[PDB]
């Protein structure tokens, strides 16, 4: 399967910025503020929880959508068919439940709160899905409960949420919006770690709430956190952020390097093979459904699979 000159996918998981708020024992919310120290112009910033702050809310909104069904561009329809059929046959044979679960787990346990949970007493993820009929779905004390996939499945509203997500991923035009709020508890005067801005010098990426500036975890940082599902790779140890070549950031070197045949554009070169491997009435191997899981997640991330 050749790689066309115009191929692009629009992303399905669309998160928003993660805005922080501080809740005082009077139960009113004031946005976080961060010192910006400068020595005499490196301007290192410092965001710590205020003194009397009872706890800290972290709100954001993530939208799952069925933008992965049709490629946003294919200058050659011959490849558009083999990808829309790829998605259809994936969904039919191995349903969306695995990708949906591995996304909603990152949503529902604090994983978008990247480092802000190292020293936290307890954080509760309250979740308000949009096409919803019940109340809010709330997970609490995520290091005491909801520690593994099973504990998630044990919550009474979990199946409905995953069903909504796989619907949004299934329907021709479905979507599913979640407003997530994390009532996080930190020790007195604890460090919050919003996303640094790209430029020692630590300068925070920030927004303005109530006219005054507050620190945020970027929408792209959060999208990176929700997409740490890629545990299917050679000698897989811990999940990666889904990428065309599974990259790591702490230890720079990149797994799924296209030398191995487990990058993206290599297992896309075999999409025709995967079509017939799924089309058989018999179930496919575990490794090949791992390859196709990574392929589907890489479509959900969307992007540009071109060669100009």
């Amino acid at each position: 399967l050749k790689l066309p000159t115009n191929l692009a996918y629009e992303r399905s998981i669309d998160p928003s910025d993660v805005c922080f708020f501080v809740v005082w024992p009077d139960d009113r919310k004031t946005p976080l503020t961060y010192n910006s120290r400068t020595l005499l112009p490196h301007q290192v910033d410092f965001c710590h929880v205020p003194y009397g702050a009872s706890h800290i809310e972290c709100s954001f909104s993530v939208s799952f959508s069925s933008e992965l069904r049709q490629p946003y561009k294919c200058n050659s329809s011959k490849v558009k068919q083999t990808l829309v059929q790829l998605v259809e046959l994936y969904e039919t044979k191995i349903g969306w439940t695995e990708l949906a679960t591995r996304y909603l787990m990152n949503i529902c346990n604090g994983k978008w709160l990247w480092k802000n949970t190292r020293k936290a007493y307890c954080w509760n993820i309250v979740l308000t899905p949009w096409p919803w009929n019940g109340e809010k779905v709330g997970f609490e004390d995520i290091r005491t409960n909801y520690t593994s996939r099973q504990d998630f499945k044990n919550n009474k509203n979990w199946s409905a949420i995953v069903e909504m997500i796989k619907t949004a991923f299934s329907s021709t035009d479905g979507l599913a919006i979640f407003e997530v709020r994390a009532t996080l508890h930190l020790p007195t005067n604890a460090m919050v770690r919003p996303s640094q801005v790209f430029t020692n010098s630590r300068v925070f990426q920030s927004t303005t709430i109530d006219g005054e500036r507050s620190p945020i975890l970027g929408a792209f940082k959060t999208g990176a956190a929700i997409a740490t599902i890629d545990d299917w790779y050679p000698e897989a140890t811990e999940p990666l952020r889904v990428g065309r070549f599974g990259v790591h950031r702490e230890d720079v070197t990149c797994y799924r390097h296209p030398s191995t045949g487990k990058d993206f554009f290599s297992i896309l070169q075999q999409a025709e093979h995967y079509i017939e491997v799924l089309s058989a009435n018999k179930t496919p191997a575990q490794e090949t459904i791992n390859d196709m899981h990574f392929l589907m997640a890489n479509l959900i991330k969307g992007g540009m699979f071109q060669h100009k």
Partner: protein
Amino acid sequence: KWYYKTITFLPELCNNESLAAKCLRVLHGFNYQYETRNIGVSFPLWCDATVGKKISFVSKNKIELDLLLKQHYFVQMEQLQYFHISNTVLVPEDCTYVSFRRCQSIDKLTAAGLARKIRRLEKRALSRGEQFDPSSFAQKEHTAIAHYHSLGESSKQTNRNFRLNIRMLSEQPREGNSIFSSYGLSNSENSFQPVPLI
């Protein structure tokens, strides 16, 4: 009557702040060994980037200067030729006096210091029966601070890691009062005192 004895750090790879902090540690241990307080310090190369290769000990007393400078740690890093000890010299021509002061107001700017300040304030105000709201004392958004250097330090009686945020401010040799902080710095509450920057 300013005697001074400088010390220059030899090793071409050395973190001067650490060595200066250890010199001040041992100076402090001295000033608490004998209750003398009349040995001040100076940094004849207080560059922008770092404290320089030198730390000088200045005193009106002559016996205490060389009594200190032959302490155990100094003779030890002398035989290992890390340090270079000079002799007890006077200097009336280097009128280029400065004041190395422990700028304590820098520790009230770190978040864990603002926490201390607010906790103390409310502990006071509630004793005064006043109404204290810790939700108003918001952190300043931009606190640009003057250039300074920091020498990490610890206390033997209670283990903690504070820092002498030492800062050099120019001055004129207004009077020899002959009193320094235990860390050999000039502090405003005690008799403020400049020192000859050799």
